[PDB]
Amino acid sequence: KNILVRMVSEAGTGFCFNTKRNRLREKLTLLHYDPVVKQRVLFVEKKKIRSL
Amino acid sequence: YKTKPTHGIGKYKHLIKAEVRAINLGTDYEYGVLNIHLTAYDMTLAESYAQYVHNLCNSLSIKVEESYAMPTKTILTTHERVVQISGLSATFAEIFLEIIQSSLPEGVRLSVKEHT
Amino acid sequence: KNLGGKSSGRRQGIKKMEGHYVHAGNIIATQRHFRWHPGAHVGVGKNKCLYALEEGIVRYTKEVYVPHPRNTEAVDLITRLPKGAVLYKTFVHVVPAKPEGTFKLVAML
Amino acid sequence: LTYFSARKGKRKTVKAVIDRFLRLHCGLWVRRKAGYKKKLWKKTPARKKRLREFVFCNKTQSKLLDKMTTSFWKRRNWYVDDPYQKYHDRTNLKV
Amino acid sequence: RRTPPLGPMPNSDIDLSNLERLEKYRSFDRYRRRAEQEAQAPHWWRTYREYFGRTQQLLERKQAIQELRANVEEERAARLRTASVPLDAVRAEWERTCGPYHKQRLAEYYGLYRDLFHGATFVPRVPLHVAYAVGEDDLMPVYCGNEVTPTEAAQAPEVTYEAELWTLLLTSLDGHLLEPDAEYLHWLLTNIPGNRVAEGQVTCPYLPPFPARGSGIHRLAFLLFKQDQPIDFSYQLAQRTFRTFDFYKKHQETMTPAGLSFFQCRWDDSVTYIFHQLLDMREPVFEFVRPPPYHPKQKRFPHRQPLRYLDRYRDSHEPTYGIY
RNA sequence: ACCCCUAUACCUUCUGCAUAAUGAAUUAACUAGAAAUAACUUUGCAAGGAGAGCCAAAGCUAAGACCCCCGAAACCAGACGA
RNA sequence: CCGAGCCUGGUGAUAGCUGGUUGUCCAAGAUAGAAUCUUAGUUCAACUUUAAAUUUGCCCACAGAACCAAAUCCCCUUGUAAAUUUAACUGUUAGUCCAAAGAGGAACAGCUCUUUGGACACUAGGAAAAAACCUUGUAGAGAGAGUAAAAAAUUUAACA
RNA sequence: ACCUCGGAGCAGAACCCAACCUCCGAGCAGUACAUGCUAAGACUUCACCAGUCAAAGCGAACCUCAAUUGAUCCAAUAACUUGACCAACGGAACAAGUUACCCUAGGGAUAACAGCGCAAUCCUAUUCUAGAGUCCAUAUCAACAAUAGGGUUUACG
RNA sequence: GUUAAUGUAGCUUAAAUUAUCAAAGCAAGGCACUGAAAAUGCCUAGAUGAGCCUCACAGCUCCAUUAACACCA
Ligand SMILES: [Mg+2]
Ligand SMILES: [Mg+2]
Ligand SMILES: [Mg+2]
Ligand SMILES: [Mg+2]
Ligand SMILES: [Mg+2]
Ligand SMILES: [Mg+2]
Ligand SMILES: [Mg+2]
Ligand SMILES: [Mg+2]
Ligand SMILES: [Mg+2]
Ligand SMILES: [Mg+2]
Ligand SMILES: [Mg+2]
Ligand SMILES: [Mg+2]
Ligand SMILES: [Mg+2]
Ligand SMILES: [Mg+2]
Ligand SMILES: [Mg+2]
Ligand SMILES: [Mg+2]
Ligand SMILES: [Mg+2]
Ligand SMILES: [Mg+2]
Ligand SMILES: [Mg+2]
């Protein structure tokens, strides 16, 4: 029912983090925080990891 | 603590009552639930007199359970409202009834009909 | 038929009693539900534990419970009480021993 | 362990001790916490920060690993840029 | 085992068997007013308090309120919520009517009476106005608790007050660099005839306030004494130290306190000028030193402590090498 | 000497054995605690010790002092047997 | 002697299992528990022993510990002399009965399972004999003395 | 039938506390995406492993829920990370039946036989008068119960 | 879990753009009536979110689903 997807930052690159979402929504796009740039940057999903 | 004089200083459920026929037992005689039907063809005259008997009861500590309404009949619709009253003493019975008599605005009829 | 129930004890309760000297960050009392509420210089964790914020001496007192108005459960319990009713809860305070610092002579300029 | 080897006649060391623990020359053993890279998505950030820590061992755990290693792993190691160089000496004990 | 209560338990006299007939708090604010009042009543258990502790005046006022409520321009401005109140008359009426009493608790809060007269209170009945001249245009007034920098208090202030012999006094209640009890005075103008302050007897000439750097915020109070008879009395700081309590004890039979004005002083750059040029000594600089952080006894085997445990017990963060 | 009074063999195993639990006729002879780093004790020398190697932020070298006996059914390899 | 011959070799196979483990004298010394293809075992803790360092340990008084019984915890005094830390390890982790609070069973068991406390596995006197009830503990000689616990009491039916 | 985790009772008031004891549940879901980094002091499921809480500080802004879970092995991935109803839940590896052809080491720690404990079951004796015995409690039998005794039985330990 | 294909009228086949037709149901017609045979209409968001052009029409985007793959102790 829930998917564990990884979210790669669109800027301040290389930094991924994992979140949950449902199977039945669209791709998540988030305003997370990068510790590389030290700003809040966009994160767009690139891969699912585990169907949970 | 139990062994201390301050035992039960913080208890509170005995101050909260968390959870009918005509009650005339030996001297303390009181009614059961009452209903007060007020029918008029004005929604303005029926809604506003439903407030005043509720304001008259609240000022005399008389318990009002429901204050709902029954729907209209298309004669022109007659609006009817029910005001549920419980508990009148012997001295209160004539006095509480006669003020609602002595405040009926314009052609609205009273009722002391009961439940079911 | 009755399976389960082999849970151990939580070992909760008061770790630092009345009158004990307690440094900042010492857990005073771990609880499951709100048995003791925090008082002066005593904080609450996520799991309702009571830790101390200053260095001092622990005192247990009884004072009037006035809940927060956004706490709609307790406010709806407050407004059912009769007109003279006052609630009480056991509070845990820390009486701070040291002062927060002195003025020391550095240098005569 | 092998208390007396069949080729030389010495103690061997358990090599599973070496790939897991770090001995400081004061006598403390330093280890990583178990599960520090397992199932990080279901852990709170406070719990994840506890796992990313080098923690010391018990008294009996330190005496068990001291028997499991020879005296080669109990010597002064004057490395160039050891990050654990400041932790080998023990300052300011009152036993 | 049960022990009976010592005094009356709460929620006991109001306790009944009927809970429907008893009227309730329907609200949160009705409960809180009863809650705040109950916390201030003394109780027989342990609480937070134990450890952390004429006829003409009414006839004139009823006539005056009936006329201010008769102008329809007033009831049009108050109803349309555009009404204002001029503060200048309210300030002048406050100092005459109840300003003595509000100035009393301000000196109780600021710790004047427990440092001036060892807990003995009085009421500043005489509304004195102390004001320091700044530049030439404006002048900085000294109310009860105000902040006046020592650059604004270099010269003596222009004291003016509406009354009819008097002594005036100033004490820096915590300016002492040596003793915790005593206080440095700044000027004592005694036997003042009526309202003219310049005619008074200077027995101590005006020192500007000198609070040391980093030593906090001082308080300096203007004592105005009602006086009947004149009495003969008596840059070195050993002459400026005295205590107000055993000074007033010598003259309480002939002289009673009658006003208050106290202000606050921080360091400024002009206190360098006072300490060096006219006091002729080095200035002292104090800093707020916090107590050292508590660390427990260092264990041999600090089990399950992080690797930064050993850093809390060393003092030099430079690598030592021992015998090598 | 006995008569009198007192006294429920021993070992092992056990919650607990006079136990009707084990073992043992008895004599003579034979028959069972082997060792490590670390600590401790005692010396030598000492910011150095050690007769190369090794250890050293009082250490280091040397000594002393702790680790049993009998018993399977089996398993495998190679011979020897109709 | 055949569910897989016999002999030699690996072989002093292995055994958490049974049996055995040899001079003298003294001293300290008994029962929380957790994990485990583990409950016939072991590892860690607890208890125990030795050596060392230090400063408190035990007993405790007011006050104090929550709402939906007996007591304990905390605790200065006081009575006392021990405890904690450090270093080095072994062994016990297959208990019994009695008193008390309960659970299971039949408000059966010399029954089973927890808890609080005794006693026993340690001597002696008693309850006849007697591990567990009662008296009593620190050791030897005496042809002295005072004591402790300590011995079951009961015999009854006329009637106007 | 069960094996892990959690709530309540036994376990009434600090903690703890068994049981093939009594009752309820859990192996998730939802909302955020600073559910960022760091760090004093502590708690701790009676060890360890893991589990908890947290001031200050940096940086910004102006988690709920009791349980809701799973170690190591260095590889799958460029990295960050992710992977077991390993549910026998401190986890070997995915390895079953059967033995009366059986063997060995042991155990009265543990069964069958017997002794013993116990007396639910069984047997017996009195108390009580309901009722049967035409009428009539007691010639005879006897319901509901009660108080004793025995130690044949089936059982239990 | 990964690779691979799949998506239809009331349901399935097909058509290489456009969408054909046999069942299903809607009546009427022959029969005393009811099933068949005709003679007629209808029923397709071509599973879809946007349209580069115009798209069953074809690539992303996709939500269901169908087979293989469900290593390595
Ligand atoms: Mg429980
Ligand atoms: Mg348990
Ligand atoms: Mg015996
Ligand atoms: Mg025998
Ligand atoms: Mg035997
Ligand atoms: Mg024999
Ligand atoms: Mg032949
Ligand atoms: Mg052997
Ligand atoms: Mg002894
Ligand atoms: Mg075993
Ligand atoms: Mg004490
Ligand atoms: Mg028993
Ligand atoms: Mg003696
Ligand atoms: Mg613990
Ligand atoms: Mg903060
Ligand atoms: Mg297992
Ligand atoms: Mg297990
Ligand atoms: Mg057969
Ligand atoms: Mg039997």
Curated annotation (Swiss-Prot), chain A:
Select a single GO molecular function from the record's annotations and give it. Answer: structural constituent of ribosome
A GO cellular component term found in this entry reads:
mitochondrial inner membrane
Repeat keyword on record: no
Q: Which UniProt keywords apply?
A: Mitochondrion, Ribonucleoprotein, Ribosomal protein, Transit peptide
Superkingdom classification of source: Eukaryota
Coiled-coil intervals, chain numbering = none
| Signal peptide (from-to) | none
Query: Which compartments does it reside in?
Result: Mitochondrion
Gene Ontology BP annotations: mitochondrial translation
Assembly and partners? Component of the mitochondrial large ribosomal subunit (mt-LSU). Mature mammalian 55S mitochondrial ribosomes consist of a small (28S) and a large (39S) subunit. The 28S small subunit contains a 12S ribosomal RNA (12S mt-rRNA) and 30 different proteins. The 39S large subunit contains a 16S rRNA (16S mt-rRNA), a copy of mitochondrial valine transfer RNA (mt-tRNA(Val)), which plays an integral structural role, and 52 different proteins.
Q: Which family does it belong to?
A: Belongs to the bacterial ribosomal protein bL33 family.
The protein's name is Large ribosomal subunit protein bL33m
Q: Which gene encodes it?
A: MRPL33
> Which part of the entire protein is covered?
14 to 65 of 65
Curated annotation (Swiss-Prot), chain B:
Q: Name one GO cellular component term.
A: mitochondrial ribosome
Q: Which superkingdom?
A: Eukaryota
Could you tell me where this protein is found in the cell?
A: Mitochondrion
Subunit composition and interactions? Component of the mitochondrial large ribosomal subunit (mt-LSU). Mature mammalian 55S mitochondrial ribosomes consist of a small (28S) and a large (39S) subunit. The 28S small subunit contains a 12S ribosomal RNA (12S mt-rRNA) and 30 different proteins. The 39S large subunit contains a 16S rRNA (16S mt-rRNA), a copy of mitochondrial valine transfer RNA (mt-tRNA(Val)), which plays an integral structural role, and 52 different proteins. mL48 is located at the central protuberance. Interacts with OXA1L.
Q: Which gene encodes it?
A: MRPL48
**According to its UniProt record, which protein family does this protein belong to?**
Belongs to the mitochondrion-specific ribosomal protein mL48 family.
Query: What protein name does the entry list?
Result: Large ribosomal subunit protein mL48
Q: Does the keyword Mitochondrion apply?
A: yes
Q: Which residues of the full protein are shown?
A: 48 to 190 of 212
Q: Which UniProt keywords apply?
A: Mitochondrion, Ribonucleoprotein, Ribosomal protein, Transit peptide
According to its UniProt entry, the protein's GO biological process terms are: mitochondrial translation
UniProtKB/Swiss-Prot annotation, chain C:
Which GO terms of type biological process are on file?
mitochondrial translation; translation
Question: Mainly resides where?
Answer: mitochondrion
Compartments, record wording = Mitochondrion
- Source domain of life is Eukaryota
- Which key words are in the record? Mitochondrion, Ribonucleoprotein, Ribosomal protein, Transit peptide
Question: One GO term of the cellular component aspect?
Answer: mitochondrion
GO molecular function terms noted in the UniProt entry: RNA binding; structural constituent of ribosome
The Swiss-Prot or TrEMBL record describes its family as follows: Belongs to the bacterial ribosomal protein bL27 family.
Q: How does it assemble?
A: Component of the mitochondrial large ribosomal subunit (mt-LSU). Mature mammalian 55S mitochondrial ribosomes consist of a small (28S) and a large (39S) subunit. The 28S small subunit contains a 12S ribosomal RNA (12S mt-rRNA) and 30 different proteins. The 39S large subunit contains a 16S rRNA (16S mt-rRNA), a copy of mitochondrial valine transfer RNA (mt-tRNA(Val)), which plays an integral structural role, and 52 different proteins.
Q: What is this protein called?
A: Large ribosomal subunit protein bL27m
- Tell me the name of the encoding gene: MRPL27
UniProtKB/Swiss-Prot annotation, chain D:
Chief site of localization: mitochondrion
Among the GO molecular function terms of this UniProt record, one is: structural constituent of ribosome
The processes (GO biological process) annotated in the record are:
mitochondrial translation; translation
Signal peptide segment: none
Keyword list, A-Z: Mitochondrion, Ribonucleoprotein, Ribosomal protein, Transit peptide
Entry's localization field = Mitochondrion
Cellular component aspect of the GO annotation: mitochondrial inner membrane; mitochondrial large ribosomal subunit; mitochondrial ribosome; mitochondrion
Q: Does the keyword field hold Ribonucleoprotein?
A: yes
The family this protein is said to belong to: Belongs to the bacterial ribosomal protein bL35 family.
The subunit field of the Swiss-Prot or TrEMBL record says: Component of the mitochondrial large ribosomal subunit (mt-LSU). Mature mammalian 55S mitochondrial ribosomes consist of a small (28S) and a large (39S) subunit. The 28S small subunit contains a 12S ribosomal RNA (12S mt-rRNA) and 30 different proteins. The 39S large subunit contains a 16S rRNA (16S mt-rRNA), a copy of mitochondrial valine transfer RNA (mt-tRNA(Val)), which plays an integral structural role, and 52 different proteins.
Q: Could you tell me what this protein is called?
A: Large ribosomal subunit protein bL35m
Q: Which organism is it from?
A: Homo sapiens (Human)
Which start and end residues of the full protein are shown?
94 to 188 of 188
